[model samples]
Target: PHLLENSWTFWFDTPAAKSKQAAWGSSMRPIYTFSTVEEFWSIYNNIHHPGKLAVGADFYCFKHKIEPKWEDPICANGGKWTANYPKGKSDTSWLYTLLAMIGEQFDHGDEICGAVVNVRGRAEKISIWTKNASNEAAQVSIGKQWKEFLDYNETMGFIFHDDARRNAKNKYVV
Candidate 1:
């Protein structure tokens, strides 16, 4: 029998107002959570890419038991490398990256916790979240493989969550 791993849950920040904070910020909606390769693909093929949604939309993929945020124990000391894409290029690129990640096409795939796609007015962004930021070799390998997986023609950069907190917001690109 195939060894079954943990399931993954998907969340979306939608436009609706479900709570006071959500009304101010985007409302996080639970889309669907799944286990097994088939279920994952089923959701992927059915949903629209982040680029297709209105501004202020986002999609987050997290492990079955955790939320996709810094507060999660799995994400506490972690960090992410992100790429912002123009709306026009969102579908092809975002879908490719998300599928590649779910497909386990990256080196040190176990280190990856989840991914997020933030759609905004100025730019749409994609991010891969990792469990530890200090694993230098794995981080580099993952970054290189990601560059290849996304077919990124431009230079890609990385930053840790600590540095992110220190840096003035919005000064860097993924």
Candidate 2:
């Protein structure tokens, strides 16, 4: 088993399906945890891809114990680089995001907390969460590498968790 630098957990949620639901995270739940390449592939094969998820479903792969929510301690002061993928490349692009994170391909890998794929009615969104919002240089570097990794041509916005909670605009773009 080829082990990763850290264990990661897959979480899923469907906020829109439960229009009659109670709370935000009521529908959210963890799927699996994997620390090895073998375990990761095994789980990946067993689950459905982002294309199959219902509209409004969210798939997350976060470092162990770090909840994928912005309120989580690991991400409370952090932010994310979110990109829109409204076309057929969502699955391919999503796969690359997971591999790049688990394989520690980013130069600023330490800043990376996890990633998420949001399946929306209009467009699929992918985000890479980071550890600190104040680390401008590190965040920018991470965002740049993310674009290159996915060969994405469009702009990706970086929004801090605090700012997002306050309904503020994106603070950075790449």
Candidate 3:
């Protein structure tokens, strides 16, 4: 059987609501979960490319049950490494990010909560979420490996959820 090391859930949301944050949070819809190589490909092939998604849309692939929100208990104190990519570049980069994650290529796999791809009008962003904000070594290693996976040479920024909530003034760039 083509089994993956960990189960993952794919989430999709295009929140345009004018309601409270909770309402927007509730709008996140899970697409599917896969636990095998074949299944991952099957789902990936059928979904709309991140590049084609509406400007406000986002695609999140997180470990099963770990919601893709900074407010989640597992993510509240966590941080994410974010990078921007040109329009068409997101498709390939997003795939590589997912493959590396699901293939357990990251050094601190246990600390990884998930990854997200935000589709915006200006540029697309891919971010990897981790479970701890204080583990500098682990976070740095993850960021370094992620950079290697995307063959991305530029410095990337890791921002804690707490800092992001305060407008992302402080960031750890690796």
Candidate 4:
């Protein structure tokens, strides 16, 4: 068995709606944790790929115990680099992103808090969350690698978690 650098947890949640009234993250369910490449393959093959998930469903792959919540201790000070893809077109990209994360392919892999895929009716969004928002060099370099891994042509937008919490417009695009 090929051991991964870090054990990762896969969490899934599907809020009934995105409205403020609906309890956000209440439906979050931790799925599985895998540390070996063989275990990872077994889990990946058994799970439904992102393309088949219903609208409003979300998939999160985070390091063990980090909990994928934007307000988590590690994620609270972070921001995410987001890319949009048409619905049903995000499966391979998501898979590659997960592979890269598990393989520690990024130069600054320690800064990555997690990765999230939001399945919507229109644009399926995938984002990489970092542990800090102030590291310009790390963030940009990450964005570059993320785009490279996905072979995506569109710009990726980085939105600060604090600004998202405040409904403010703090952002960066690479």
Measured over all alpha carbons after superposition, the RMSD of each candidate to the real structure, in angstroms, is 3.3, 1.6, 1.9, 2.2
Best by TM-score: 2
Between 1 and 2, whose TM-score is larger?
2
Segments in model 3 whose C-alpha atoms lie over 4 Å from true places: 15-22
lDDT values for all models? 0.72, 0.89, 0.88, 0.87
lDDT of 2 by residue, 1-174 (tens): 799999999998866535656767667788999999999999998997899888878899999999887788889999999988884449999999999999999998999999999888888999999998899999999999999999999888899998876466789988
Please identify model 4 stretches exceeding 4 Å from their true place: 15-22, 166-170
Q: For candidate 1, lDDT tens digit of each residue in 1-174? A: 222265777888765433335333336766898877778778877886775777777788776776676666787777787776877576777767766666677778888888888888888888888877788777777877887888876656556666554452422333
Q: Clashes in model 1: which pairs?
A: none
User: Candidate 1, 115: how far from true, in Å?
Assistant: 0.6
Writing each residue's lDDT as its tens digit, candidate 3 over 1-174 gives 589889999998865531334765687788899999999999999998887887878889999999988889999999999989987679999999999999999888889999999988889999999998798899999999899899898989899998776468436778
Candidate 1's C-alpha lDDT? 0.72
What would the TM-score be for candidate 3 when compared with the true structure? Answer: 0.93
For all predicted structures, in order, the TM-scores are 0.82, 0.94, 0.93, 0.93
The true-structure Cα RMSD of candidate 1 reads: 3.3
Largest lDDT belongs to which candidate? 2
Order the numbered candidates by lDDT, best leading.
2, 3, 4, 1
Candidate 4 TM-score over all chains jointly: 0.93
Task: Give the C-alpha lDDT of model 2.
Answer: 0.89
